[PDB]
Amino acid sequence: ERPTLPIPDLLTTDARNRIQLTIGAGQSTFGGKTATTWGYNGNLLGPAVKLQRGKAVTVDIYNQLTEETTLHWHGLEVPGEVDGGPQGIIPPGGKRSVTLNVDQPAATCWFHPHQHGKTGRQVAMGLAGLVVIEDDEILKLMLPKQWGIDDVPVIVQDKKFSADGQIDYQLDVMTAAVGWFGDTLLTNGAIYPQHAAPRGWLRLRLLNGCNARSLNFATSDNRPLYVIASDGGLLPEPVKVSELPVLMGERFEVLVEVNDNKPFDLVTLPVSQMGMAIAPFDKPHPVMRIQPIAISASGALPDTLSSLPALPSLEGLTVRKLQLSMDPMLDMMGMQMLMEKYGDQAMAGMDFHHANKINGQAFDMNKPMFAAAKGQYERWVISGVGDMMLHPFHIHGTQFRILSENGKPPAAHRAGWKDTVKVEGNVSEVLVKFNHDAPKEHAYMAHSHLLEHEDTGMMLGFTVLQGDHG
């Protein structure tokens, strides 16, 4: 029998208004082999922290690893001091506390390490958790809302393991060039689980938690997915899709219909990204089995969900150009190693530690590239012209609107609030506004979310201090 889908615990504040997260090493089992893994409040992955718009929470973070880490709340708009970028060091055996004052629409965000140069390994070892933000608006909708029954998080990740069963992560030339990817797909940490869902509407909060692998969700029997929310919250109305591409670090919430006596699989379809259509990912691959059950369910697919504000006029806004690049030598060496090992299938459908760059500079923790304005829209133009690697570009401190995505206006289910934009051999443009401060000592990051590229230099720091005084 397939294992049941693990359900992260939904963790709320205690009487002291505190949430405790312990970062630690333990053991997990994959395919009958034990592996050392890391987790928040457990052996692997983490809980779902539940936050309400307009309410403060204090998080106490206990680092019980033997190495430094940081804790970043990806998708949360918070000041730099509590954003948990690479400057937010938590010593091994130490504790750090942050007060989060949540001020943004309901959405599914997530959290993960951001340790300088080591983010890929620390996520690969198992660290990731979820953030569920609620507000008044969303609860009035009739959405499926029973956590772990008809409202379920789905954190999808690949791993590769060595013969001893341990997770096999090394940041070497090939993995630095193409990304860390594996042959084993996990869904909330389990291999091909089943989830028992009541007849009616099932809400899936999908996260691509892979280091480097893009995904493309669909159902085994071609039933549609109704997209209701993206990274930064609800869309204005549901968007019906037959397939749903999801970049690394992106979330979408979808509703799917569950009918009596008709089990089906959520699957991922082959993608056109270097290295990612190697067997078993050359064909549709299962993510999990949905098994209909007969218990109570009241959830609805609402005709209307929210209102999206009009894009502001673009005239007169500051433009920032961010040119992404990879060292041609790393690109050539890594691509050759990939082709030699896997052959043509590795391109199907198509020293090095500071090799990857933005505007000619590898990330410098001591030197923010610029100071962005506070409380003012800017247009950021991000280019990957010059290579054909996938760069899901993420900017801390904001939920943004995509104006142009890699050659075209964004797809309808990508036109709302986003914290990731596709850049791949073309140029994208986003409209951003920073509402919180970030000083040089706790700067915001902007980077590709292909973690091995972030780790080898494709990140910049930026500060936010003041708006116009002119």
Interface residues toward Cu ion, by CB under 5 A: 74, 249, 396, 445
In the complex, the smallest distance separating the C-beta of residue 64 from Cu ion, rounded to whole angstroms, is 22
Closer Cβ to Cu ion, 195 or 449, answer by number: 449
In the complex, the smallest distance separating the C-beta of residue 188 from Cu ion, rounded to whole angstroms, is 18
Task: Dihedral sign for Cα 151, 157, 163, 165, please.
Answer: negative
In the complex, the smallest distance separating the C-beta of residue 419 from Cu ion, rounded to whole angstroms, is 6
Amino acid at 222: N
Contact 331, 170 (CB under 8 A): no
Residue ranges of alpha helices (H) inside 320-425 are 328-342
Closer Cβ to Cu ion, 110 or 226, answer by number: 110
| Paired tokens of 188 | 């909330």
Closer Cβ to Cu ion, 42 or 249, answer by number: 249
Amino acid at 456: T
In the complex, the smallest distance separating the C-beta of residue 459 from Cu ion, rounded to whole angstroms, is 7
Q: Rounded CA gap, 265 and 271, in Å?
A: 18
Closer Cβ to Cu ion, 264 or 462, answer by number: 462
Residue nearest to Cu ion (CB): 74
Q: 175-186 as b/e, with b when 16 or more CB fall inside 10 Å? A: bbbbbbbbeebb
In the complex, the smallest distance separating the C-beta of residue 115 from Cu ion, rounded to whole angstroms, is 11
Closer Cβ to Cu ion, 195 or 401, answer by number: 401
Closer Cβ to Cu ion, 289 or 396, answer by number: 396
One DSSP character per residue, 138-203 reads: HHTS-----BTTTEEEEEEEEE-B-TTSSB-----HHHHHH----SEEEETTBSS-EEEEESEEEE
In the complex, the smallest distance separating the C-beta of residue 449 from Cu ion, rounded to whole angstroms, is 6
Closer Cβ to Cu ion, 109 or 389, answer by number: 109
Contact 418, 401 (CB under 8 A): yes
C-alpha distances in Å from residue 134, one per residue of 17, 139, 203, 244, 467: 17, 7, 15, 24, 29
Q: β-pairing, 48-52 with 10-11?
A: parallel
Q: Rounded CA gap, 285 and 293, in Å?
A: 24
Closer Cβ to Cu ion, 200 or 249, answer by number: 249
Closer Cβ to Cu ion, 267 or 458, answer by number: 458
Q: Rounded CA gap, 438 and 441, in Å?
A: 8
In sequence order, which residues have a C-beta less than 8 Å from that of residue 197 and are 6 or more positions away?
149, 150, 152, 258, 290, 291, 292, 293
In the complex, the smallest distance separating the C-beta of residue 109 from Cu ion, rounded to whole angstroms, is 9
In sequence order, which residues have a C-beta less than 8 Å from that of residue 5 and are 6 or more positions away?
152, 154, 187, 188, 190, 193, 194, 195, 288
Phi-psi label, residue 319: left if phi above 0, alpha if psi -120 to 50, beta otherwise: beta
In the complex, the smallest distance separating the C-beta of residue 233 from Cu ion, rounded to whole angstroms, is 15
